[PDB]
Protein backbone atom coordinates (compact mmCIF):
# COMPACT_ATOMS: atom_id res chain seq x y z
CA UNK A 1 0.00 0.00 0.00
CA UNK A 2 1.10 3.48 0.96
CA UNK A 3 4.58 4.56 2.06
CA UNK A 4 5.43 8.12 3.01
CA UNK A 5 8.68 9.93 3.79
CA UNK A 6 9.07 10.15 7.58
CA UNK A 7 10.83 13.08 9.51
CA UNK A 8 10.57 13.94 13.21
CA UNK A 9 12.43 16.93 14.61
CA UNK A 10 11.09 15.75 18.01
CA UNK A 11 12.44 12.14 17.65
CA UNK A 12 14.34 12.52 20.90
CA UNK A 13 11.45 12.90 23.43
CA UNK A 14 8.89 10.64 21.65
CA UNK A 15 11.49 7.78 20.99
CA UNK A 16 11.39 7.39 17.12
CA UNK A 17 13.99 7.78 14.39
CA UNK A 18 14.78 11.08 12.91
CA UNK A 19 14.55 10.01 9.28
CA UNK A 20 13.00 7.31 7.18
CA UNK A 21 9.84 6.11 5.70
CA UNK A 22 6.57 5.41 7.45
CA UNK A 23 4.20 2.63 6.29
CA UNK A 24 0.59 3.77 6.33
CA UNK A 25 -2.21 2.01 8.04
CA UNK A 26 -5.96 2.91 7.81
CA UNK A 27 -9.09 0.67 7.88
CA UNK A 28 -10.69 -0.54 4.66
CA UNK A 29 -12.81 2.33 3.12
CA UNK A 30 -10.43 5.15 3.51
CA UNK A 31 -7.78 7.18 1.87
CA UNK A 32 -4.31 7.54 3.06
CA UNK A 33 -2.19 10.60 2.59
CA UNK A 34 1.35 11.91 3.24
CA UNK A 35 2.18 15.24 4.83
CA UNK A 36 5.00 17.69 5.53
CA UNK A 37 5.40 20.56 7.84
CA UNK A 38 8.07 23.13 8.25
CA UNK A 39 8.99 26.54 9.29
CA UNK A 40 10.48 29.35 7.27
CA UNK A 41 10.81 32.71 9.26
CA UNK A 42 13.69 34.21 7.41
CA UNK A 43 14.27 32.27 4.07
CA UNK A 44 15.79 29.08 5.59
CA UNK A 45 13.67 26.03 5.82
CA UNK A 46 13.39 24.26 9.21
CA UNK A 47 11.75 20.91 8.90
CA UNK A 48 9.23 19.97 11.57
CA UNK A 49 7.60 16.62 10.60
CA UNK A 50 6.88 14.47 7.56
CA UNK A 51 4.71 11.31 7.63
CA UNK A 52 1.40 9.54 7.00
CA UNK A 53 -1.85 11.41 7.50
CA UNK A 54 -5.34 9.92 7.82
CA UNK A 55 -8.27 10.36 5.25
CA UNK A 56 -8.84 14.14 4.95
CA UNK A 57 -10.78 15.90 2.17
CA UNK A 58 -8.25 18.82 2.07
CA UNK A 59 -5.70 16.18 0.75
CA UNK A 60 -8.04 14.34 -1.74
CA UNK A 61 -6.38 14.07 -5.25
CA UNK A 62 -3.35 16.20 -4.65
CA UNK A 63 -0.28 14.52 -6.12
CA UNK A 64 2.24 17.12 -4.93
CA UNK A 65 2.71 18.47 -1.39
CA UNK A 66 1.71 22.19 -1.75
CA UNK A 67 1.07 24.32 1.38
CA UNK A 68 -1.83 26.75 0.55
CA UNK A 69 -2.42 29.11 3.56
CA UNK A 70 -1.49 32.68 2.87
CA UNK A 71 1.30 33.36 5.37
CA UNK A 72 1.56 30.69 8.06
CA UNK A 73 4.10 30.45 10.92
CA UNK A 74 4.00 26.68 10.35
CA UNK A 75 3.54 25.42 6.79
CA UNK A 76 1.63 22.21 6.17
CA UNK A 77 0.87 20.30 3.03
CA UNK A 78 -0.77 16.94 2.31
CA UNK A 79 -1.03 14.69 -0.66
CA UNK A 80 -2.02 11.36 -2.17
CA UNK A 81 0.45 8.84 -3.55
CA UNK A 82 3.62 7.07 -2.56
CA UNK A 83 6.41 9.32 -1.25
CA UNK A 84 4.35 12.35 -2.34
CA UNK A 85 5.86 14.40 0.51
CA UNK A 86 9.36 13.94 -0.64
CA UNK A 87 9.22 17.50 -2.02
CA UNK A 88 7.11 20.33 -0.73
CA UNK A 89 6.39 23.89 -1.80
CA UNK A 90 4.17 26.88 -0.87
CA UNK A 91 1.52 28.14 -3.24
CA UNK A 92 -0.65 30.53 -1.24
CA UNK A 93 -4.25 31.03 -2.05
CA UNK A 94 -6.81 33.67 -0.86
CA UNK A 95 -7.77 33.00 2.74
Amino acid sequence: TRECIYYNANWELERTNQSGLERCEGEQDKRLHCYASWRNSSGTIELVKKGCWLDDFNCYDRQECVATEENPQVYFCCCEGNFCNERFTHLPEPG
Binding site: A9, Y35, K49, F76
Partner: protein, 96 residues
Protein backbone atom coordinates in the same frame (compact mmCIF):
# COMPACT_ATOMS: atom_id res chain seq x y z
CA UNK B 1 -33.97 13.83 10.83
CA UNK B 2 -37.69 14.19 10.60
CA UNK B 3 -40.27 16.98 10.90
CA UNK B 4 -42.67 14.61 12.79
CA UNK B 5 -40.82 12.41 15.19
CA UNK B 6 -37.93 13.54 17.32
CA UNK B 7 -35.88 10.39 16.24
CA UNK B 8 -32.21 9.84 17.21
CA UNK B 9 -30.07 11.09 14.25
CA UNK B 10 -26.88 12.68 13.02
CA UNK B 11 -26.76 16.55 12.98
CA UNK B 12 -23.99 18.29 10.96
CA UNK B 13 -21.67 20.62 12.66
CA UNK B 14 -18.48 22.05 11.28
CA UNK B 15 -15.76 23.02 13.81
CA UNK B 16 -13.70 26.14 12.91
CA UNK B 17 -10.65 26.27 15.10
CA UNK B 18 -10.25 30.12 14.55
CA UNK B 19 -13.75 30.65 15.89
CA UNK B 20 -13.47 28.77 19.28
CA UNK B 21 -9.90 30.11 20.19
CA UNK B 22 -7.97 26.92 19.25
CA UNK B 23 -6.05 28.11 16.09
CA UNK B 24 -3.06 29.36 18.22
CA UNK B 25 -2.27 25.72 19.21
CA UNK B 26 -3.75 23.77 16.21
CA UNK B 27 -1.78 24.06 12.90
CA UNK B 28 -3.82 21.56 10.90
CA UNK B 29 -6.59 21.14 9.84
CA UNK B 30 -8.12 24.58 10.03
CA UNK B 31 -11.23 22.68 10.94
CA UNK B 32 -13.63 19.85 10.29
CA UNK B 33 -17.16 18.33 10.50
CA UNK B 34 -17.43 17.17 14.10
CA UNK B 35 -21.12 16.26 13.93
CA UNK B 36 -23.38 15.45 16.93
CA UNK B 37 -26.28 13.12 17.86
CA UNK B 38 -29.62 14.40 19.00
CA UNK B 39 -33.05 12.92 19.44
CA UNK B 40 -35.05 10.67 21.66
CA UNK B 41 -34.44 7.06 22.68
CA UNK B 42 -35.39 4.26 22.71
CA UNK B 43 -36.22 4.02 19.01
CA UNK B 44 -39.80 2.91 18.19
CA UNK B 45 -39.65 4.17 14.53
CA UNK B 46 -37.77 3.43 11.16
CA UNK B 47 -26.29 -7.04 17.10
CA UNK B 48 -25.92 -6.26 20.86
CA UNK B 49 -28.36 -3.96 18.99
CA UNK B 50 -30.82 -6.84 18.72
CA UNK B 51 -30.00 -8.85 21.87
CA UNK B 52 -30.66 -5.71 23.86
CA UNK B 53 -33.81 -4.45 22.03
CA UNK B 54 -35.20 -7.98 21.75
CA UNK B 55 -34.72 -8.65 25.47
CA UNK B 56 -36.33 -5.00 25.75
CA UNK B 57 -39.76 -5.43 23.89
CA UNK B 58 -40.20 -8.37 26.28
CA UNK B 59 -37.98 -8.01 29.37
CA UNK B 60 -29.77 7.52 24.94
CA UNK B 61 -28.92 8.95 21.53
CA UNK B 62 -25.12 8.50 20.94
CA UNK B 63 -22.44 7.94 18.33
CA UNK B 64 -22.59 4.43 17.03
CA UNK B 65 -19.84 4.94 14.44
CA UNK B 66 -16.84 7.23 14.27
CA UNK B 67 -13.87 8.20 12.07
CA UNK B 68 -10.42 9.09 13.48
CA UNK B 69 -8.56 12.32 12.37
CA UNK B 70 -4.90 13.52 12.16
CA UNK B 71 -3.96 16.68 13.92
CA UNK B 72 -0.77 18.76 13.96
CA UNK B 73 -0.70 20.97 17.00
CA UNK B 74 1.42 22.60 19.74
CA UNK B 75 1.65 20.65 22.95
CA UNK B 76 1.90 22.16 26.43
CA UNK B 77 5.68 22.53 26.29
CA UNK B 78 5.39 24.35 22.86
CA UNK B 79 6.55 21.49 20.65
CA UNK B 80 4.84 20.44 17.50
CA UNK B 81 3.15 17.06 17.71
CA UNK B 82 1.17 15.00 15.23
CA UNK B 83 -1.40 12.53 16.54
CA UNK B 84 -4.12 10.42 15.03
CA UNK B 85 -7.04 10.97 17.27
CA UNK B 86 -9.79 8.38 17.59
CA UNK B 87 -13.48 9.18 17.74
CA UNK B 88 -13.31 12.68 16.25
CA UNK B 89 -15.99 12.60 13.58
CA UNK B 90 -19.43 11.19 14.21
CA UNK B 91 -20.57 9.34 11.09
CA UNK B 92 -23.60 7.68 12.66
CA UNK B 93 -26.00 7.87 15.62
CA UNK B 94 -28.24 5.36 17.32
CA UNK B 95 -29.96 4.48 20.61
CA UNK B 96 -28.00 2.65 23.34
Amino acid sequence: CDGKVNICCKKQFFVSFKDIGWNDWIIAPSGYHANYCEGECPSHIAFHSTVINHYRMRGCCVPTKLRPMSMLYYDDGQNIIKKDIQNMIVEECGCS
